mmCIF file of C-alpha atoms and ligand atoms in Angstrom:
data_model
loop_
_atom_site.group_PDB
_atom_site.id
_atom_site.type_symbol
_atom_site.label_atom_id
_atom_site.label_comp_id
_atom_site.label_asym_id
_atom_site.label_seq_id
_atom_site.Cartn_x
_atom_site.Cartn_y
_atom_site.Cartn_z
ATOM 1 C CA UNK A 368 105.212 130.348 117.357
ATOM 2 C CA UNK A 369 108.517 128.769 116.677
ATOM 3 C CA UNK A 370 110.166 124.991 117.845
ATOM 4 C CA UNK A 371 111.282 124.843 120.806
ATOM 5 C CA UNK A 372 114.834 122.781 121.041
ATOM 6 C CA UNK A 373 113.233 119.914 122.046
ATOM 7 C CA UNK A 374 110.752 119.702 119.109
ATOM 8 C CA UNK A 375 113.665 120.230 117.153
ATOM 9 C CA UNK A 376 115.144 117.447 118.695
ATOM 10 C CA UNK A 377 112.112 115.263 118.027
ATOM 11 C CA UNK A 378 111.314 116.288 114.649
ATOM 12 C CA UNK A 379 114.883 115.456 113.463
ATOM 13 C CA UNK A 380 114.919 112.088 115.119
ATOM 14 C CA UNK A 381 111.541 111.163 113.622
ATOM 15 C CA UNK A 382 112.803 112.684 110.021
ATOM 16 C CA UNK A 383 115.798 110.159 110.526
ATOM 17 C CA UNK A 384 113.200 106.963 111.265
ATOM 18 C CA UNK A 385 111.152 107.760 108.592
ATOM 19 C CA UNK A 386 113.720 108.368 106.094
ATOM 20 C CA UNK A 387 115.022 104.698 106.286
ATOM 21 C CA UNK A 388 112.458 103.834 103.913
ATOM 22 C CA UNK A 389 112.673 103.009 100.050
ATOM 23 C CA UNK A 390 113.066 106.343 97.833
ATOM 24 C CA UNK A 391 109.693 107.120 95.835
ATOM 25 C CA UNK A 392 111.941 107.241 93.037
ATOM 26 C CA UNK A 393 112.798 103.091 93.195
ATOM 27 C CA UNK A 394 108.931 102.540 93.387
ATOM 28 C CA UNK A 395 108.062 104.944 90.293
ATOM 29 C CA UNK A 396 111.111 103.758 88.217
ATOM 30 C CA UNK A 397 110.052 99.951 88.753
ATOM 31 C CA UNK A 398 106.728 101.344 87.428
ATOM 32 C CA UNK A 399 107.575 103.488 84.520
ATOM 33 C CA UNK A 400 110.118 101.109 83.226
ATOM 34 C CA UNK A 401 107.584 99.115 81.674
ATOM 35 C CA UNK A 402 104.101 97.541 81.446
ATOM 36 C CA UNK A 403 103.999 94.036 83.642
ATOM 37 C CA UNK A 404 101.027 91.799 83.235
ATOM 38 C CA UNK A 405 97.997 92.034 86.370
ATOM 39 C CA UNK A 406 100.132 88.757 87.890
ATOM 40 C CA UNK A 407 103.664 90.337 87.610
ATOM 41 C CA UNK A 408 101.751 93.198 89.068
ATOM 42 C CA UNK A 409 100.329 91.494 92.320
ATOM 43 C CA UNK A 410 103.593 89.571 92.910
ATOM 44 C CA UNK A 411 105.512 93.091 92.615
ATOM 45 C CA UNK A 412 102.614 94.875 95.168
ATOM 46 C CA UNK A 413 103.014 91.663 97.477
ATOM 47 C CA UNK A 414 106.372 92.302 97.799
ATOM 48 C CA UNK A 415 106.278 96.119 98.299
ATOM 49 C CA UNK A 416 103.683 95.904 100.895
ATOM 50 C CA UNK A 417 105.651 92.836 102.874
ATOM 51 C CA UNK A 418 108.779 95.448 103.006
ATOM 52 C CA UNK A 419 106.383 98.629 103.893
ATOM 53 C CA UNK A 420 105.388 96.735 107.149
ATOM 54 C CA UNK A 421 108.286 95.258 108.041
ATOM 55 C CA UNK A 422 109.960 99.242 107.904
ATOM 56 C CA UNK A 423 106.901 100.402 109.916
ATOM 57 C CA UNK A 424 107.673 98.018 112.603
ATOM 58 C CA UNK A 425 110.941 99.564 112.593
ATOM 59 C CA UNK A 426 109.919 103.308 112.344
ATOM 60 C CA UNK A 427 107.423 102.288 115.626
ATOM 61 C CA UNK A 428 109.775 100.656 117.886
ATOM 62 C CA UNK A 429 111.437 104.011 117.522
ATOM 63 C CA UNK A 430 108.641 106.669 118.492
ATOM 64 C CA UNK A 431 109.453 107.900 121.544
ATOM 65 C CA UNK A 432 107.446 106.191 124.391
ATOM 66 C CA UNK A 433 106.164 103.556 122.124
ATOM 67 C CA UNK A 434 108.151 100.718 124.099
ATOM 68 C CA UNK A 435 106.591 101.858 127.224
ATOM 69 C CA UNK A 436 102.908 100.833 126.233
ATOM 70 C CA UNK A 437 101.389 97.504 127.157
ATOM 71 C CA UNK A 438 102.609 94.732 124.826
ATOM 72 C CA UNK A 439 98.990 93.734 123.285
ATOM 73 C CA UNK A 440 98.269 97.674 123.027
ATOM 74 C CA UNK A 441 101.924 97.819 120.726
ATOM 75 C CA UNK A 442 100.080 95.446 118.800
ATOM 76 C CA UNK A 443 96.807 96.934 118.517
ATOM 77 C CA UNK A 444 98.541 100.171 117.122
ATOM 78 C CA UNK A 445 100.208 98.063 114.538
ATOM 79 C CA UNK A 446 97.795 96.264 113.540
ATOM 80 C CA UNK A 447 95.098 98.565 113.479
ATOM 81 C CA UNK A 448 98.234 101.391 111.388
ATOM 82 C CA UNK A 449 99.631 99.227 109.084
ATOM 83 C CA UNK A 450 97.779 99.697 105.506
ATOM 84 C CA UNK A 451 96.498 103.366 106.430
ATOM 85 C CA UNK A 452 100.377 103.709 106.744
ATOM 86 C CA UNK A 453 100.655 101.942 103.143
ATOM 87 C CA UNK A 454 97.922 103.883 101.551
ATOM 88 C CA UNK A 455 99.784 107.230 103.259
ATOM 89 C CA UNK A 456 102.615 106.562 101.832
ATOM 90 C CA UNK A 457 101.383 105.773 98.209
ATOM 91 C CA UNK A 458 99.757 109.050 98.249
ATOM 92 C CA UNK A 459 103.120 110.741 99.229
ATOM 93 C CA UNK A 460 104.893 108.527 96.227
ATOM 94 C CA UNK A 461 102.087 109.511 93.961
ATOM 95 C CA UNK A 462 102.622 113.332 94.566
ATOM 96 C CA UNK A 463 106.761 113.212 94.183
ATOM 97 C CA UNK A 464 106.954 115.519 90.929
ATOM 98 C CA UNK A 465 108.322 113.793 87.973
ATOM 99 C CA UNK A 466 109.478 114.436 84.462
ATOM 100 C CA UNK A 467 106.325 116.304 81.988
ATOM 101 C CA UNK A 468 104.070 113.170 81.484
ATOM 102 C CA UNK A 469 105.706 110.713 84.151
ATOM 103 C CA UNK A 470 102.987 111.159 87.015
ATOM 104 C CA UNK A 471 99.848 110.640 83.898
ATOM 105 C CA UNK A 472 101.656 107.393 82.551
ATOM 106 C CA UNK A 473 102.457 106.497 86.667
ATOM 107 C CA UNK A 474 98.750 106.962 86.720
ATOM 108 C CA UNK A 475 97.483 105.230 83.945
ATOM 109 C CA UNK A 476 100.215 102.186 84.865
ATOM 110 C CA UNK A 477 98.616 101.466 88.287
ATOM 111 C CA UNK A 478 94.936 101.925 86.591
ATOM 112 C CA UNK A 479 96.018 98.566 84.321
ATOM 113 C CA UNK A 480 97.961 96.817 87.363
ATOM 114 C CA UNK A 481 94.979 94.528 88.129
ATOM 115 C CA UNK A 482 93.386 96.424 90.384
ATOM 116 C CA UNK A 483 89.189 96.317 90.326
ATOM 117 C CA UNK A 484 87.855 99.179 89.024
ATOM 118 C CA UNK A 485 85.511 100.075 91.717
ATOM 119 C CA UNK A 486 88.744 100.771 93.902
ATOM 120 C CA UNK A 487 90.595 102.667 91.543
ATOM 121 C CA UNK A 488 88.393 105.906 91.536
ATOM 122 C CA UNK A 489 88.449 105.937 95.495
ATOM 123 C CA UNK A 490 91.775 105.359 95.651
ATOM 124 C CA UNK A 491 92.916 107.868 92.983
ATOM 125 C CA UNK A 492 90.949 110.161 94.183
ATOM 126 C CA UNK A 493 92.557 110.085 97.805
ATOM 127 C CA UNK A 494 95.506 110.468 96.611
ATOM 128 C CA UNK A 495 95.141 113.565 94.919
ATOM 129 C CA UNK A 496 92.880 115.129 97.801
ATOM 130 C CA UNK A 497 96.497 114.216 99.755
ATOM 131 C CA UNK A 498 98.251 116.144 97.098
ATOM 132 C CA UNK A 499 96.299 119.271 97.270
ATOM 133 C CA UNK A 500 97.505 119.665 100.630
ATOM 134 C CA UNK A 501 101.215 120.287 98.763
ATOM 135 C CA UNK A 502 102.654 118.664 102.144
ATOM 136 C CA UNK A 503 106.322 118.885 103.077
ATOM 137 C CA UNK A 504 108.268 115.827 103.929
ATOM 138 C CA UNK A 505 107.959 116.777 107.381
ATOM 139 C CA UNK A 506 104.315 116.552 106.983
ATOM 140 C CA UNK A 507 104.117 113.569 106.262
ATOM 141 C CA UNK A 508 106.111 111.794 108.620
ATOM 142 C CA UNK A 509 104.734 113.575 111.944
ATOM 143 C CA UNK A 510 101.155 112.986 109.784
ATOM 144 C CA UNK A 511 102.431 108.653 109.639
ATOM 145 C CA UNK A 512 103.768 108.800 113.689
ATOM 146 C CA UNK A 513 100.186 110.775 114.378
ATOM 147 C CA UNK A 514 98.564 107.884 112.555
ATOM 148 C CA UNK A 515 100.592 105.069 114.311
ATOM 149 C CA UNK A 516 99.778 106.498 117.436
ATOM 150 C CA UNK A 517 95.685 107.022 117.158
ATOM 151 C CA UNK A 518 94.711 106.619 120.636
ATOM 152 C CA UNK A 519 90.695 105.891 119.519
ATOM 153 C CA UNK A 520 92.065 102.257 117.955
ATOM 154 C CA UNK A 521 89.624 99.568 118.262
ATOM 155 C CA UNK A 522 91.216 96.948 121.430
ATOM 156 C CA UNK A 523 93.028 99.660 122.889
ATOM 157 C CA UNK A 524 92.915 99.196 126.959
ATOM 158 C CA UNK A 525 94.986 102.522 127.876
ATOM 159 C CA UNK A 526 93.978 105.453 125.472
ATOM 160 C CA UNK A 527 95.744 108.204 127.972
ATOM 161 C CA UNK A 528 99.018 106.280 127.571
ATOM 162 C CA UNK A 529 98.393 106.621 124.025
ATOM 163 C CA UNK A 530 97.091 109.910 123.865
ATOM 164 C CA UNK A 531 100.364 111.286 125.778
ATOM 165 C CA UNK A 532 102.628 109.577 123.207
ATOM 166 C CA UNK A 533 100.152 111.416 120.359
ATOM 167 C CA UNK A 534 100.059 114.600 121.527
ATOM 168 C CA UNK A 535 103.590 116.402 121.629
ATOM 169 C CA UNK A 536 103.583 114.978 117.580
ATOM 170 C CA UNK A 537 100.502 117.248 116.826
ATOM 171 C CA UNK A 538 101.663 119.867 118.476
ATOM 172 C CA UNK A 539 105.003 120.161 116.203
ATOM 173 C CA UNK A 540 103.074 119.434 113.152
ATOM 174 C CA UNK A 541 100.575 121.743 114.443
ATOM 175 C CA UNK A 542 103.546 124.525 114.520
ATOM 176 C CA UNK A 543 105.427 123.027 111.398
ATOM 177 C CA UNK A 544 101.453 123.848 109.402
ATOM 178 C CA UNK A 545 101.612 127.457 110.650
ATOM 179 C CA UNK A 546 105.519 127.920 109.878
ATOM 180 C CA UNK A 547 104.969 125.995 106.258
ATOM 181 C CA UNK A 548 101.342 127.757 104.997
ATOM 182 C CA UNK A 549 100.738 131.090 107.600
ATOM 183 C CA UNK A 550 98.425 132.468 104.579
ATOM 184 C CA UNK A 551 96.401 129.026 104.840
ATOM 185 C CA UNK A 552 95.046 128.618 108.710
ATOM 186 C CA UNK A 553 93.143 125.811 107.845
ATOM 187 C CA UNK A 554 96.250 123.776 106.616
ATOM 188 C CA UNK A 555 96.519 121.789 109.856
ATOM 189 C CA UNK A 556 92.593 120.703 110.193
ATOM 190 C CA UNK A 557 92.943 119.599 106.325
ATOM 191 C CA UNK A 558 95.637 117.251 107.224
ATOM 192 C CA UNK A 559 93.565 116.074 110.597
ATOM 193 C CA UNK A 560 90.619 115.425 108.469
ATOM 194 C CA UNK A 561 92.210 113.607 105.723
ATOM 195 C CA UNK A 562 92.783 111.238 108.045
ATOM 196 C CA UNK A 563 89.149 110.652 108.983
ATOM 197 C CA UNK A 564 89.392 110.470 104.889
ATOM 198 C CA UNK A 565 92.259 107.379 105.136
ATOM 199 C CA UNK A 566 90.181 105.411 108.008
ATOM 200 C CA UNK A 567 87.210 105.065 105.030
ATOM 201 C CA UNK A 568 89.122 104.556 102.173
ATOM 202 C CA UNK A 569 90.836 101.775 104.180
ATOM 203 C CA UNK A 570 87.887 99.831 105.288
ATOM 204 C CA UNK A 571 87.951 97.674 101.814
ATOM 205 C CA UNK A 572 92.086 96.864 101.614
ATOM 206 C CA UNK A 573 91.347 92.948 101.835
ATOM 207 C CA UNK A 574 88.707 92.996 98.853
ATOM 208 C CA UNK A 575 91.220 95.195 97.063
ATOM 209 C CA UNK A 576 93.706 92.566 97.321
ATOM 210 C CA UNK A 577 91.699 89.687 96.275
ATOM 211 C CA UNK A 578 89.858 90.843 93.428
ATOM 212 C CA UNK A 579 93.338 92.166 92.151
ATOM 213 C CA UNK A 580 92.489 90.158 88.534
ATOM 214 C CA UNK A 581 94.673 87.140 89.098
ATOM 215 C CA UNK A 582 93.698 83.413 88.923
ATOM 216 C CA UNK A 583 95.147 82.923 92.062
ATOM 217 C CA UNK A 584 95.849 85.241 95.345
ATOM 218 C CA UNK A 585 99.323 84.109 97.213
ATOM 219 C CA UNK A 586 99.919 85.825 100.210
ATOM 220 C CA UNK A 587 102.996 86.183 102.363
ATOM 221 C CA UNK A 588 102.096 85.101 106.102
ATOM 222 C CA UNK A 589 103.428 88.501 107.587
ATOM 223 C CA UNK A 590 100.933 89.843 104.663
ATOM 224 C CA UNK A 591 97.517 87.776 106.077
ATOM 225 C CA UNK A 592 98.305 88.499 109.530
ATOM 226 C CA UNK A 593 98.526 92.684 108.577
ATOM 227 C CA UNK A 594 95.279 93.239 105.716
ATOM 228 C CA UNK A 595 93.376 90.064 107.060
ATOM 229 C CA UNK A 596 93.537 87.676 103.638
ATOM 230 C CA UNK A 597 94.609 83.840 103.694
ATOM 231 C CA UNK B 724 96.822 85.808 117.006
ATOM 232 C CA UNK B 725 99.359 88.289 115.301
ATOM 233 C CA UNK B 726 102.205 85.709 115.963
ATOM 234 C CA UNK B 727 104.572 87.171 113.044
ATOM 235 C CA UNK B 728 103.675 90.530 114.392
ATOM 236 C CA UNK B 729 104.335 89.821 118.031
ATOM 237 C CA UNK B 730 107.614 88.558 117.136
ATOM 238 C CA UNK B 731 108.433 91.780 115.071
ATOM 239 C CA UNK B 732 107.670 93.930 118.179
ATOM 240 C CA UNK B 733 109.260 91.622 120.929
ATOM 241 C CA UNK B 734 112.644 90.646 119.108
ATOM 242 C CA UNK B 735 116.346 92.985 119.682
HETATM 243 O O1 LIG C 282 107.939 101.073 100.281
HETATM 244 C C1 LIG C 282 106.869 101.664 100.334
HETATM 245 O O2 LIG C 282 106.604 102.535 101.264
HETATM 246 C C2 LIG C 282 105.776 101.439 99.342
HETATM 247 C C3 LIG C 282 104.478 101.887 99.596
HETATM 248 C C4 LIG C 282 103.459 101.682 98.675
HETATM 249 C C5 LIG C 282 103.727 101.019 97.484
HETATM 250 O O3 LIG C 282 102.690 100.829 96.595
HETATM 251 C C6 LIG C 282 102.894 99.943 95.471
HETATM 252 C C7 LIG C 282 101.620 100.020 94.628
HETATM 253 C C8 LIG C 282 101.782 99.509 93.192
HETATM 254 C C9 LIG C 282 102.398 98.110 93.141
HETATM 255 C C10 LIG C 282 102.579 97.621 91.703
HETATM 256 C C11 LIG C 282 101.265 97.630 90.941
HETATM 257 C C12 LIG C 282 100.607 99.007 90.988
HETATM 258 C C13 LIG C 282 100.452 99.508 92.432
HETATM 259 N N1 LIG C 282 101.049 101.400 94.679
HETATM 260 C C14 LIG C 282 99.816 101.725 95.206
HETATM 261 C C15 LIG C 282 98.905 100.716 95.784
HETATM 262 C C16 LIG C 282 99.088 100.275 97.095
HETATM 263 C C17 LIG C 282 98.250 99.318 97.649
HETATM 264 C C18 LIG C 282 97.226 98.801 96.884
HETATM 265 CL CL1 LIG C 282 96.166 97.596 97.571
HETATM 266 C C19 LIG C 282 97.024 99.215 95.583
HETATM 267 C C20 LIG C 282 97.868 100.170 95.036
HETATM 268 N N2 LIG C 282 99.549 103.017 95.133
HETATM 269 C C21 LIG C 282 100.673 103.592 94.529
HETATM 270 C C22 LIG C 282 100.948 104.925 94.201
HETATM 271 C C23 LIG C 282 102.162 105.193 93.597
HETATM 272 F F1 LIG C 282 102.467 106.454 93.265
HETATM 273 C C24 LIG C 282 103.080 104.197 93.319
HETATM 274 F F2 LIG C 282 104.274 104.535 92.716
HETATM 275 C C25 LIG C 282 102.836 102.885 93.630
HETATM 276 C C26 LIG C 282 101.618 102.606 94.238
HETATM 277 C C27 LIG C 282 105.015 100.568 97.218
HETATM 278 C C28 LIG C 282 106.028 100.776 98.142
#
């Protein structure tokens, strides 16, 4: 039924990682402030997403056990994380309620960043699937340590060593799902599946980069080494 | 090769 200390314990501690991130509110302000050309746009997105992995490396040094695992399987977990993480994370900025007409302008903002068109429904729509969920802040970050730690990574050697890092993190979002929606069983699946959901929408993050509608495409070398682009 | 990576995860 309820936590037990320890899951107490680790749900605080993780709350505290994840929390050392940038407010949603200095990302939607940025936005909402006003319109930037699709080159302003790319440079500002560039930027963003070279700070959201560098934090990520931080918040998964700190999982517990993650230091234990073999050095090129610490890298497989990044690597293979890092823009589901992103994408994760946009949806949770996307779904922070704002001021009456804020969230259709945030919308309609990102729609006219530069961004191909053929991404923008996909995208849009994952986002919102994420938001029907109505997930807590707790939600989220067990959902973005669950993610991090997918045992079934491609160039993983040890999945067990994985899997036992994984597993007490489902089992207190598992408990947090029943505690947060007990009139919705299916509440913890949904969040499980969405992430079958993030692993699709992801498989096109380099073309979404590059046919951002810029002359040119400058990357930052942490950036081509993370979403494969030169 | 990951090297920027590598260092991220290796470094304090
Ligand atoms: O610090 C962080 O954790 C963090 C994480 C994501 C992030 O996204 C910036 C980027 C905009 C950048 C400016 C031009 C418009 C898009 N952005 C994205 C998006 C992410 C990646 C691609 Cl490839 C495309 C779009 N989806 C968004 C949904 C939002 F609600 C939102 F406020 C901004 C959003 C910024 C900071």
């Amino acid at each position: 039924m309820e936590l037990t200390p320890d899951q107490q314990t680790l749900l605080h501690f993780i709350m505290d990682s994840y929390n050392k991130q940038r407010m949603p509110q200095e990302i939607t302000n940025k936005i909402l402030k006003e319109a930037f050309s699709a080159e302003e746009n790319f440079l500002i997105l560039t930027e963003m997403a070279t700070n959201h992995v560098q934090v990520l490396v931080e918040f998964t040094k700190k999982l517990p056990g993650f230091q234990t695992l073999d050095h090129e399987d610490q890298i497989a977990l990044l690597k293979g994380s890092a823009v589901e993480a992103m994408f994760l994370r946009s949806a949770e900025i996307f779904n922070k309620k704002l001021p009456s007409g804020h969230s259709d302008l945030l919308e309609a903002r990102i729609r006219n960043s530069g961004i191909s068109d053929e991404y923008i429904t996909p995208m849009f729509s994952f986002y919102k699937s994420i938001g029907e969920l109505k997930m807590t802040q707790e939600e989220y970050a067990l959902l973005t340590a669950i993610v991090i730690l997918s045992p079934d990574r491609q160039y993983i050697k040890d999945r067990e060593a994985v899997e036992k890092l994984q597993e007490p993190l489902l089992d207190v979002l598992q408990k947090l799902c029943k505690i947060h929606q007990p009139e919705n069983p299916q509440h913890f699946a949904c969040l499980l599946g969405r992430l079958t959901e993030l692993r699709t929408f992801n498989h096109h993050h380099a073309e979404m980069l590059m046919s951002w509608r810029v002359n040119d495409h400058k990357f930052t070398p942490l950036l081509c080494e993370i979403w494969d682009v030169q | 090769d990951h090297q920027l990576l590598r260092y991220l995860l290796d470094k304090d």
